[PDB]
Design a protein around this nucleic acid. Sequence first.
RNA 1: UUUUUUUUUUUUUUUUUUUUUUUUUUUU
Lengths: 245, 244, 245, 245, 245
Amino acid sequence: MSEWSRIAVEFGEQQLNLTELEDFARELAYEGLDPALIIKKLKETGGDDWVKDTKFIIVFALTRGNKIVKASGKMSNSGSKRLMALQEKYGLVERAETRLSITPVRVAQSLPTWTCAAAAALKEYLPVGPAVMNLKVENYPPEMMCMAFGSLIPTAGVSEATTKTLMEAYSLWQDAFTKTINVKMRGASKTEVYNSFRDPLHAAVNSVFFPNDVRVKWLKAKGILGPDGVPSRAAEVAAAAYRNL
Amino acid sequence: SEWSRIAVEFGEQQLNLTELEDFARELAYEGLDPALIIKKLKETGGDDWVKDTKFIIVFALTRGNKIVKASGKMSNSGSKRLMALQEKYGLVERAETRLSITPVRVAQSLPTWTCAAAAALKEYLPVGPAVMNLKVENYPPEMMCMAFGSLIPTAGVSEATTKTLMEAYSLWQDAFTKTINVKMRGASKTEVYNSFRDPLHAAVNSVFFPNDVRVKWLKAKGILGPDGVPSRAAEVAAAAYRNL
Amino acid sequence: MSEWSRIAVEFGEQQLNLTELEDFARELAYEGLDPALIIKKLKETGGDDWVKDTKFIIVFALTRGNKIVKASGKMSNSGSKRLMALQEKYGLVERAETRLSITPVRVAQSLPTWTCAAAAALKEYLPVGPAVMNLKVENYPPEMMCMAFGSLIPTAGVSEATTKTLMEAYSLWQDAFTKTINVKMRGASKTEVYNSFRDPLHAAVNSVFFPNDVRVKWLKAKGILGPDGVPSRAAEVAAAAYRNL
Amino acid sequence: MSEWSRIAVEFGEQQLNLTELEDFARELAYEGLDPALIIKKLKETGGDDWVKDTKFIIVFALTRGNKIVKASGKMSNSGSKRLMALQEKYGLVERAETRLSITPVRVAQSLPTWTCAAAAALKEYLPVGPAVMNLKVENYPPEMMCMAFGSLIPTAGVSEATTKTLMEAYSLWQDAFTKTINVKMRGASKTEVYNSFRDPLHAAVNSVFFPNDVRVKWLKAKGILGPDGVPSRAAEVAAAAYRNL
Amino acid sequence: MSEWSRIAVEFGEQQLNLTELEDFARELAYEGLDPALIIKKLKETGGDDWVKDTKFIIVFALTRGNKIVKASGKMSNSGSKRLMALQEKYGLVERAETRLSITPVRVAQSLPTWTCAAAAALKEYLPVGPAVMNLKVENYPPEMMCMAFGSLIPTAGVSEATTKTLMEAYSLWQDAFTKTINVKMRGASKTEVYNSFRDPLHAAVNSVFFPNDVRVKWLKAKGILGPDGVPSRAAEVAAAAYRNL
RNA sequence: UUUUUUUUUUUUUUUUUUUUUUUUUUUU
């Protein structure tokens, strides 16, 4: 023939090796919540005030969302004046055009070990609170009532069965949140709304920046799982409720 | 890594409940405050605010909030005064902040006046008997207004009455939404309620306009009977909208 | 609670004055055409040659439409420059965005009497011809055969019963015109096509700018209406044909 | 009332000039394309290579379409060098917006005899070839598998009955062609298809550039029309299928 | 009737020599993206390291799309400098404009002998994979979740019915792929979703790039068809799934 | 990333050789 197919066919006798091919996929994957760079801008700009600085931004992401410019107009005058100062201080963005972009939801997503705890303390003020969420699943735990907690769910050191059921329970909250927060997904099918958060959620659970030691010791402290390592009663009934309509 | 440990250490710190609660109240959602729009409305006009507001009210009742676009397709006499009132109050065609003062905002901020006026303007509203009379008969003109969302009460009256009055109200503005939006025309009914459930309930749940006067004004308009049952036009509208 | 809320309840409880309010209601209604302004713009700008300049503009609307840019490239190039010369001189537009906006059809709608006479003198050159109109109805009046006839139909001084017959007869020409001029409208129901031009037509006949006293004398002099105030034979048969699908 | 009421009345009371209005009507009458004009540009700039160059443009519209840039990036490099020169030589525009605008489709339908003769010898290369069209009618003549036969069906010298059959026979090819070529129009009804090419088809039939006498002579030589002046067997069967969707 | 109507028809009646018009029918025919044309650029620019560079591009095509800017903005640091470096050497673009334009999926579609095995190894990392598809067909062939397996569908040496089953079993993956990856294609009928990927499929299958002697040998080695030449049970079980929607 | 937002046409629609589609395609 020629160099047309002979080179192409000759490429095939090379035998693929699993680890190196996996490494390319491991190195080349979707993630938009890089814990490394997201925290550098907070600490480097503010030496000691960053601890109270991150207090303001994270609760803004947990309560209202990411539309900084749209929220500020509908914000209180006292809140808007300082929020814009924080906006100018770091240069926050509303749309995650790039990974290095600083948006409040990543800050919450990068410090979930408190964000979930803050959600427990702030239940009535959540975007989807007990007034609406409790009408879907009985006695739902308030810790899981958050957006950033998805990075705290374990993936190693605990049985995969607990991970699967806890995946289902969290996914139900996303269904309640996504329908309420977005008008487009209102009235859509159960799978259609589920299609909206496969990638960000699966990236959080498989994230390796958090060691598996901190999550397992934190979960048992809040009672979301029992001493034996299985999720609490409220978790499974939430997971079971997701199976049915 | 080192920065992995500080995140672990940061979360182990005991959160301040009263400080966090202080943050939450400041960051709680705030919407159109009818007290501030009246404040700007009252302070700018010393004595003509009574007659200047109703001129803006009828403009929002008849035409949209597009100030500049409506002025170019309107009578010359009306254009001169509207532009003068435009500069006097600093109206904005769109609502970016809570301080923004758009003509439709004034309509919803004074529901009692703006909605009784629409009763006599049956042939002048953007949508009325000329469009939806083929669906319902003897439609009440006293609620053919953009501000009737803030007039329907939920306390002091039975819950079922609130549902049907909301159910009847949705019929008028279902056609209004379909006629007013090019992309929304010919869409599913489920999309009509989904794209409208959020704005409707905010006006209903508002606690600015007193609840006792809501029913009393509605009582004199014939919408609610003396016994407390919705008028015949309410149920027939309720039955018509549910079945497409 | 607040005393200012009590101001709102009293402000709306006062009895509304219907007569004064209705004055506002008519004052804020839309009026897409102002025949005073269309004449005023031409007279003040090019009044030196306004006698001849307006004649070319209207006959263009008589024989074609509003698409200046699309029409300038298809017509003869000997006079295409002059139309483009008149394009910049007066500022014609293809769409009526505002009242100040001027289109060729608007000029025709502002001088209903002359354009009907011009249509009579140029019967063969209209987009719809008497040849297809002859098949529909015999001896159709070429002066009635014009777009701007709607603004010339009388509503006062003549009985309403015969006005509808003239209205129905004119609708036959409009039905043929709008079917030919728009390719998509062909093969449609009789009531649907009649509704595409119904709204502009009723607004045109009810216009107050053109006096009704001069409307009758012009209409009688052109042979459509006899000296007794009754339609001619051609007018009645044209209306009768329209009533039959 | 004011001057504007008087201006409208007095202008219509003026005596119109019959020759002045008649002059404007003829000037504003237009023709889509006179094939004499299109040959003027082609023949003048080409001294002796115009016969080969026209033979190059003619089949490019007959085989690939009226897009110079879109085609040039998806065809042979040997032909791209020459074809790019042809566009620069004649100033070929992609879209025909003016009567002076020159596109390969205009040249394709400006030489009706040679264009559709070429399509007969290249059946497998048409965008709508026998393979995709044999499922609608059996034994369709190759000479009609072209976009220039619309101007080959005559008006004078043949009866109205045979002309209608030829129009209907061609309309079937256009129905397959228009559905295939118009993206926005693929899922349209049968009565909508006839409206899409209603005006363009009758424009070619009524064109006066290409004489009627050669039209009937060309048809009989190609077997389309019988020696006695009647359509061939393949004509009515194509027309019948068009009538039957 | 004119000297120019005659000159237009004089060469339109000339007999056409087939060996000069069909000659200008293959120089103008369609050749889309040509395999071995993209390969040449890879060999000429990175001949010392094209083996390693090609694998990274193929992995990117498998686990991502064509938007190089969108993908690079939400992924790791180390890959971003690596992928951007390979971008300027090889000139990868997100949109294909010509035959010479190279997009990352195109490189992976001209070497299916590797990406099929690569897809099987990384079945967990495909944008659409078994995890969202095992509920459709059990024990699906792992080397199917790739865009290049269709260019190696056999056409000679095997029955046509076998090819249709392989075509159908391949048709299922895009039915899961284009439905999930395209919001517009979501909720589409089975007939129109088939036509979206029908045209690229036939060209890939009918391509003469791959000799069929090695096509079957590689296909046999993957075990989804027996040594007798009939597809394994995994293909036929997919056949039942596709036919009933 | 919604929680009182959406203002469409409203005496306009403007055709008489126009539309050039797919043919290893798109990653929201």
